[PDB]
Amino acid sequence: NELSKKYLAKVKERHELKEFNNSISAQDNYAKWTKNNRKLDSLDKEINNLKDEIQSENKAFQAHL
Amino acid sequence: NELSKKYLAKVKERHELKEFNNSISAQDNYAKWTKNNRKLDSLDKEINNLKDEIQSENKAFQAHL
Amino acid sequence: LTVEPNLHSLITSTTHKWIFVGGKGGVGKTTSSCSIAIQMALSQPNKQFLLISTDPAHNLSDAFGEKFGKDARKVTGMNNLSCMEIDPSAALKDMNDLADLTGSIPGIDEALSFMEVMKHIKRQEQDEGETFDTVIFDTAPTGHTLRFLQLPNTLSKLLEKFGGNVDISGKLNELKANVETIRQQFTDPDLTTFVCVCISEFLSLYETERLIQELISYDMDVNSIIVNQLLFAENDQEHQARWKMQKKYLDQIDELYEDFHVVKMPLCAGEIRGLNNLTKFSQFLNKEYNPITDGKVIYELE
Amino acid sequence: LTVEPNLHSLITSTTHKWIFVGGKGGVGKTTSSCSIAIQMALSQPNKQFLLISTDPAHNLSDAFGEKFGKDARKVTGMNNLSCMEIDPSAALKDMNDLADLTGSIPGIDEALSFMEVMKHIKRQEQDEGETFDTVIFDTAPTGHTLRFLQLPNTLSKLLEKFGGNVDISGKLNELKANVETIRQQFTDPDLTTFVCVCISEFLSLYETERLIQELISYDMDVNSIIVNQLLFAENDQEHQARWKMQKKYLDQIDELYEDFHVVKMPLCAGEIRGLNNLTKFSQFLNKEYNPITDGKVIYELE
Numbered sequence A, B: 001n002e003l004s005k006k007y008l009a010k011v012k013e014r015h016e017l018k019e020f021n022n023s024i025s026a027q028d029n030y031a032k033w034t035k036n037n038r039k040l041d042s043l044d045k046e047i048n049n050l051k052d053e054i055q056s057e058n059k060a061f062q063a064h065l
Numbered sequence C, D: 001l002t003v004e005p006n007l008h009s010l011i012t013s014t015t016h017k018w019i020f021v022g023g024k025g026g027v028g029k030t031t032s033s034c035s036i037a038i039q040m041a042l043s044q045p046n047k048q049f050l051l052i053s054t055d056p057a058h059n060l061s062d063a064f065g066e067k068f069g070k071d072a073r074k075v076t077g078m079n080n081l082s083c084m085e086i087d088p089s090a091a092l093k094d095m096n097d098l099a100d101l102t103g104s105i106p107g108i109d110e111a112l113s114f115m116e117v118m119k120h121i122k123r124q125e126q127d128e129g130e131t132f133d134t135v136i137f138d139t140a141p142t143g144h145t146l147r148f149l150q151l152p153n154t155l156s157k158l159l160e161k162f163g164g165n166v167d168i169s170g171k172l173n174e175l176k177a178n179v180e181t182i183r184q185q186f187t188d189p190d191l192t193t194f195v196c197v198c199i200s201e202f203l204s205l206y207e208t209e210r211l212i213q214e215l216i217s218y219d220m221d222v223n224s225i226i227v228n229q230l231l232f233a234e235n236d237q238e239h240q241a242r243w244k245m246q247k248k249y250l251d252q253i254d255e256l257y258e259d260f261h262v263v264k265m266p267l268c269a270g271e272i273r274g275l276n277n278l279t280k281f282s283q284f285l286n287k288e289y290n291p292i293t294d295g296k297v298i299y300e301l302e
């Protein structure tokens, strides 16, 4: 319920945000543009955290009968 | 006569040039300044070549009785 | 027997197939990259072109005011210039979900990413059955995008004296090929070349000097420098402290690179966006800009 | 309850001991680096200062018109500001005539080079029996000069799961100390801080945004941005297209960083060299520049 509803919500959200950022002048809206970017850089890691959260729980059930 | 007169001539020349470059406005004489630099970048390697020329002739006399 | 201060020679060339455009700092790499394309695309109607960008901020889309994606579209208002925006860093990151020996070897990640680009291109020429005679690279803003050219020589300096614990030493010899087949090409002054953009201020002249050196080592052909955003303040309709300095450096650059095609572009009032202006501005890459006569064309841009 | 658009808070501070100054592109890092020093040196006569530079082109010597070397000299015309120009890359290259595990580990070379600097400093405070209360770093123009701050955390992510074939795993644990003792300091918003220089154009605002992020990760305190080379063209004695754009970005930056000390400097006619001008220009870091009233002081500079 975690390694799924999470790994998606975000990857999805990120994916959703990514396309939006590509609908604004990084030039006329540098303000917003960079804000969004900063965000994506965040999701980019917590998704890369759930990628190890989901991988530690595997090397776990198999190292423990 | 080589691994000495060479390894010096240059290291020396370089050393000599280095101090000179530090006597001119990298700003008012960018022309000359960068020329000299390009040069030093050359000596910087052939000196690093004689550093292996002198080191291959050691691993040589000792690998060959 | 001096060298023409413009890119005509290049825009006229029929031999080249690869042209790289780059320069750090906000000096107009993008603007120049687009300019060389359009200019190349207008001067040779027969040939089909491709202007590609790796930048994630999708700059070419900003430059033309159109939405170019991963699919080689054609510029609206053109006939042989097509733009393609792709992000290799992301692509190469999916077929990698280890690279341990990549971070270990300086130059791998690049080669990889590059080839990931070429692929996306030959793929476009298949589903589109359309062959590109020349491609223009809007080199990434930061990072040494094309450092892999040394990959060959370096992979040799760690084989005769260095070691599926060996299926690694195989798909690696297989690479020192893809790369050397390529490097051999880019190292051919007739097929590929690099154009450096730069603003005429100190720190920028340095960087571009650095770069030129970097390309020299790689044995890539560096022959042209386009100095962008110049003032020529004295030729305005009426009365400047910066132009005094710029002029200063300009003289220096002419003296430093005597065999180079040093192009001087003007700093227009406001953005240079869209085909209509880009084309209008780009022509100064072919026939050099004359502050006197052409003083007006730089005020037609918005 | 807004934040003051200037560095007064910093120049007034008595707590700080370390202040880093940096920014790519020819935007005035050097000029700013000198300015913060002089300003800091004049506002606190009791304290003794040190402005150091790693750049090989010897920029501080260019900025003041004096010949500062490896020996901490005092600025002629000053009393508590001393400049020191050193090249670590060369130094660390002599006691290395292997580092194989350096290129292998990202961040080693830096830490090393840094410590090579600190040394040359404590050495100056010994033969000179003169203690520096605050030092200012003219961060290297290219390269991540201070990336070693991650060295600790990374050296741990390769110890519990990784291995005189072991005298290496010793003089290494000995380092993950020197670095963490340090990192702990620089990561103290009261002792050390970073000031970013930037020109108000797109590509430059990007880079500085990048950088700010980089410093954020390192857990370094980034609080101030000095936007240099502004026009304020409308306040001249009489009639500009660039100022329109700059103004554009300025508004954006104020909106992006609301809690930041955003300082706006003016673009004077010609160089800003030597103590007399540097001091004159620097005061606009303390009391913000007013285009109206202070429009003249920017024409006293050469």
Ligand SMILES: Nc1ncnc2c1ncn2[C@@H]1O[C@H](COP(=O)(O)OP(=O)(O)O)[C@@H](O)[C@H]1O
Pocket (backbone or CB within 6 Å): C023, C024, C025, C026, C027, C028, C029, C030, C031, C032, C059, C228, C229, C230, C265, C266, C267, C268, C269, C270, C271, C272, C273, D203
């Ligand atoms: N010669 C010029 N004169 C006036 N404005 C220019 C000129 N060249 C570029 N620009 C401006 O700069 C912007 C493009 O900057 P850009 O080329 O993307 O910097 P970079 O190449 O480093 O990415 C455009 O919006 C345009 O308004």
Ligand SMILES: Nc1ncnc2c1ncn2[C@@H]1O[C@H](COP(=O)(O)OP(=O)(O)O)[C@@H](O)[C@H]1O
Pocket (backbone or CB within 6 Å): C203, D023, D024, D025, D026, D027, D028, D029, D030, D031, D032, D059, D228, D229, D230, D265, D266, D267, D268, D269, D270, D271, D272, D273
């Ligand atoms: N605000 C300014 N107005 C006018 N000229 C400036 C200003 N700031 C810096 N300069 C000029 O730029 C030069 C210093 O550039 P520099 O600070 O060394 O670029 P960087 O910091 O990237 O090394 C000086 O010679 C000076 O003439």
